[PDB]
Design a protein around this ligand. Sequence first.
Ligand SMILES: Cc1nnc(CN(Cc2ccc(C#N)cc2)C(=O)CSc2ccccc2Cl)o1
Ligand SMILES: Cc1nnc(CN(Cc2ccc(C#N)cc2)C(=O)CSc2ccccc2Cl)o1
Ligand SMILES: Cc1nnc(CN(Cc2ccc(C#N)cc2)C(=O)CSc2ccccc2Cl)o1
Lengths: 255, 252, 255
Amino acid sequence: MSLIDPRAIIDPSARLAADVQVGPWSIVGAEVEIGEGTVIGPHVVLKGPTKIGKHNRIYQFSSVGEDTPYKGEPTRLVIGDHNVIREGVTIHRGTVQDRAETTIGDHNLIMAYAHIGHDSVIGNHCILVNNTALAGHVHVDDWAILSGYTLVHQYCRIGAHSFSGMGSAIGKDVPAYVTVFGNPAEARSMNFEGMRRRGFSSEAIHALRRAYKVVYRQGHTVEEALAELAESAAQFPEVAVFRDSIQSATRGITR
Amino acid sequence: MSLIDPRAIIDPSARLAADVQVGPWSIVGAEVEIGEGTVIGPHVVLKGPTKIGKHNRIYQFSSVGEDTPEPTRLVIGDHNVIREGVTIHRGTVQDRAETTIGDHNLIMAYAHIGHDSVIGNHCILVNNTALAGHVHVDDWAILSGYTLVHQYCRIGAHSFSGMGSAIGKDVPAYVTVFGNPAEARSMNFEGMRRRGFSSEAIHALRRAYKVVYRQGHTVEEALAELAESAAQFPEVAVFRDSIQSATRGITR
Amino acid sequence: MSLIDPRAIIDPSARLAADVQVGPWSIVGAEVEIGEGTVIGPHVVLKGPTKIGKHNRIYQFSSVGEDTPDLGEPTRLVIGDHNVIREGVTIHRGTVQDRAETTIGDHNLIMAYAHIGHDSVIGNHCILVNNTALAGHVHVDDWAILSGYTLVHQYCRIGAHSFSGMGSAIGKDVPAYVTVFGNPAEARSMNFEGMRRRGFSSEAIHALRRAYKVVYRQGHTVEEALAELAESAAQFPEVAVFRDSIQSATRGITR
Ligand SMILES: Cc1nnc(CN(Cc2ccc(C#N)cc2)C(=O)CSc2ccccc2Cl)o1
Ligand SMILES: Cc1nnc(CN(Cc2ccc(C#N)cc2)C(=O)CSc2ccccc2Cl)o1
Ligand SMILES: Cc1nnc(CN(Cc2ccc(C#N)cc2)C(=O)CSc2ccccc2Cl)o1
């Protein structure tokens, strides 16, 4: 049996690496580029201009590279390497001219029926659990986990190693390591489980626990908090990752 | 390349207008009528008795015209966009509760339109919005992502629900609702300005909101107080009529 | 015509009863077993080791028998008789080694886009309404009704004849007959409506109303409540079902 199933439709403008697998009844549309070792399942719709990197797995009933719901404006979707895109996932392209294309990095897991809205940016090692929805212009940093049915408002930033509880509705920025829950989302604590899994030192975990309290439990303003964290951020690069996510928040921080 | 892809299944009783496009591996079932300029994507399941109007677009993995889990019908108007994975059930004809969708609607990815529901014109049902059944959505309503609507609920003209809202009661026209359970917050003044409502009409609607929600009046007292402004501004009469026709009470 | 559509793919290791119907563009994977009177719709993906019983109906765009997006461990899915699996439903296999296969009994209705996580167990006469998600290791007892978009945390037990309202987020065990609402889920009352439809005696309904008060409205600890329910449970099999569900609660009960 051929690597490209004879029941699949490959557009003559699509560029594929030699070992790409494409399952039956799948469409690889115009201007779709697919890298080495990628596996396209059956019943998949791929639309371009889209770049899919190496060693990716895209499951049935997914629509990857769709137009968002002027004529001829260049729009693009870039997906890196070692990603898993499960059944029914929808991923929209993003505008090129303004450097706001839809981008997905490496080693991500995008679970069933998740939605990635136009101009969203997903880093590396993220997990978007079933039916997570990024409205659009969402920035998800490395190792973030969004539990099932997490809804993210347009323009929100989800910090590195952050966590959302199931059914959370995020309206403001989530700082690095922070855990959020409910509709509307509220900050609860820090992802100490994720910190341990990543092999963080005891001094680094303690400095981060102290950092959370400075921001959320000591009644200080964002301006007051950032000034107090300066000393701790200089000694630990992980407290600096927390400090930078607060400093770069536009919609305010999830409290 | 033919308009009707040779890999699609078209039942002999289906009636398609000459320029209708059907993508590969789509099923156009028996008693399905499709009007001029409509585009059916690939992997679409269309079941009848269903009448689809002119210049519609139906995306992949949609199931339109499903039986509810006696002649039943589904009627879809003109210029609608039905995105990927949307599910639309038919409604009962004898009791005049067929499922109806008007014109210029945008029904986004994985939205669900339960049996006997009625959607007006220019409505937006964002991703995963779910109408349980017998839901009436009036013109220009916006239901944000993952809005859930209890059976028999009425969604007023130009109303708005925030993301993840769970609506159990009627939403009056223009009203903005948020959360689970849904709570009224304000009016959609932004929408009024886009529609070209006058400053005077907006002013009267803002006063009408206060009468219903911020002055401790009963529904009976509020309706009597709005009578004067409703005769003067047709937009206020839209707001008053939606409260008058509320069978499950109003969202507060 | 032909019971198996010529456009369907039937793996040579699949075992089917002679009258099994399979629609166009459906995949019946390796190690899939399908019983008498079952109808598989078009665009269905079935993956094994999976057993599907008699007189079942599986709708378009469903992925039944897939492996979880995180694990040579042999895993299985077993589905009983007279079930209806609506469009876009995802059902994952379990694990055999620790006796946690994913199992679904008889006369169940699994509505559009519902998710059945790995190692979950569904009894009989249950209804999972549109987009209900069982994260994994979830036990759903007989006649439970989970309203649209109900989210169920891993390891939660849903009691017999219980009911969740639309958009409920369940993080603790739901006792038998209990009605729960919101995110986080909160106990409200009992499903008396369901009892009456099931033909429960007025005496059994009266005893269950009293049982709810003992657990939830009289300031008793779970130890105290279980001691007070002992007498009623010995007399009413329906009260024993309620008592057993509180006894077997590992995550505490939904209050
Ligand atoms: C299974 C399981 N393992 N951990 C959890 C908790 N979790 C976060 C999480 C989930 C998966 C990975 C992984 N790889 C990591 C973290 C949730 O999102 C629960 S909700 C949910 C879960 C699954 C489907 C639908 C829903 Cl709604 O679930
Ligand atoms: C994109 C975008 N543009 N506006 C918004 C806000 N919006 C209303 C809205 C959304 C789209 C149109 C349109 N055509 C109009 C209004 C939401 O529904 C947010 S939630 C959400 C949003 C998108 C996907 C999934 C989810 Cl869950 O999102
Ligand atoms: C229709 C209808 N008939 N009863 C209800 C109430 N119901 C429970 C329920 C639903 C169906 C059966 C059945 N067979 C039994 C109980 C809900 O879940 C409402 S929410 C919902 C409902 C439908 C789609 C999306 C959503 Cl979100 O809806």
